[PDB]
Short mmCIF file of C-alpha atoms in Angstrom, two decimals:
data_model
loop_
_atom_site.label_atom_id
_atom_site.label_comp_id
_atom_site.label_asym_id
_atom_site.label_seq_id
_atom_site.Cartn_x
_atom_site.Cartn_y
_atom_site.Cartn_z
CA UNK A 5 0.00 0.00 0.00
CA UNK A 6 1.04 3.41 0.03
CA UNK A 7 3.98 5.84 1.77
CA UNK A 8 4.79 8.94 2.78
CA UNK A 9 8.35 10.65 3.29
CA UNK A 10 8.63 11.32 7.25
CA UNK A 11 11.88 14.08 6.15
CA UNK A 12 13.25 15.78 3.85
CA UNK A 13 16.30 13.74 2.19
CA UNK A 14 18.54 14.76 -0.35
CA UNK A 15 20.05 12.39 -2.62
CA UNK A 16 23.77 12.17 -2.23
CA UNK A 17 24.06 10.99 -6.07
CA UNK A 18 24.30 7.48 -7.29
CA UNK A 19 20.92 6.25 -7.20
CA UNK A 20 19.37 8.15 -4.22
CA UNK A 21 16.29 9.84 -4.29
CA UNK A 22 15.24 13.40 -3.22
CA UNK A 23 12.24 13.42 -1.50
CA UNK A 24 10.10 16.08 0.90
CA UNK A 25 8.51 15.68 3.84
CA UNK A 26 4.78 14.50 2.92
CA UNK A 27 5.53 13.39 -0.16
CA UNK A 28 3.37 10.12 -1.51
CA UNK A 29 5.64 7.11 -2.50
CA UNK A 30 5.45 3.72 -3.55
CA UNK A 31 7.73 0.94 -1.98
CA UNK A 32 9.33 -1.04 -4.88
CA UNK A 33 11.78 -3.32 -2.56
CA UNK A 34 14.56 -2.99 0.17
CA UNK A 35 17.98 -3.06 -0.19
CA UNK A 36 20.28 -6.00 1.05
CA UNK A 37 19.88 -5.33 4.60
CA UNK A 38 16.36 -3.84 4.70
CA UNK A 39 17.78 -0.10 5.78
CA UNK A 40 17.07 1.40 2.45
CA UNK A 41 14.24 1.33 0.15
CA UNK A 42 13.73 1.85 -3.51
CA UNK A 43 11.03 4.26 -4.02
CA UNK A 44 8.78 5.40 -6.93
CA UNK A 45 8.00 9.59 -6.37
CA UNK A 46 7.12 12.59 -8.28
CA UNK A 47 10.77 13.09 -8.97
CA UNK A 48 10.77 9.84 -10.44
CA UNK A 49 12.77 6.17 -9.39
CA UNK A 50 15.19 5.47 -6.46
CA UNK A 51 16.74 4.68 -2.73
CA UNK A 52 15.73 6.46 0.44
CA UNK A 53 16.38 5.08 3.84
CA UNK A 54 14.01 3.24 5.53
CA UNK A 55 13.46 5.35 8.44
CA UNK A 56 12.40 8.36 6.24
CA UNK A 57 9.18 6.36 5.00
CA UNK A 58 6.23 4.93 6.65
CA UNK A 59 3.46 3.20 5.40
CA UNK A 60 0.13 4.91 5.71
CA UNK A 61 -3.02 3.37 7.28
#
């Protein structure tokens, strides 16, 4: 189901992902140790941590 960005992050190049506080997201998948996530934003395709997202119920 769906996400929302918990901070602001900005991407610190390779495949990071800006995102803003509020900010709707889709989860794609986690990363090998489940600390980052691949999101789909806005701004388009790529990794935020974990801790910046939570699902909304």
């Amino acid at each position: 189901n769906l996400f929302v960005a918990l901070y602001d992050f900005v991407a610190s190049g390779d495949n990071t992902l800006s995102i803003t506080k509020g900010e709707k997201l889709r989860v794609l998948g986690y990363n090998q140790n489940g600390e980052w996530s691949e999101v789909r934003s806005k701004n388009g395709q790529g990794w935020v941590p974990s801790n910046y997202i939570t699902p909304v119920n």
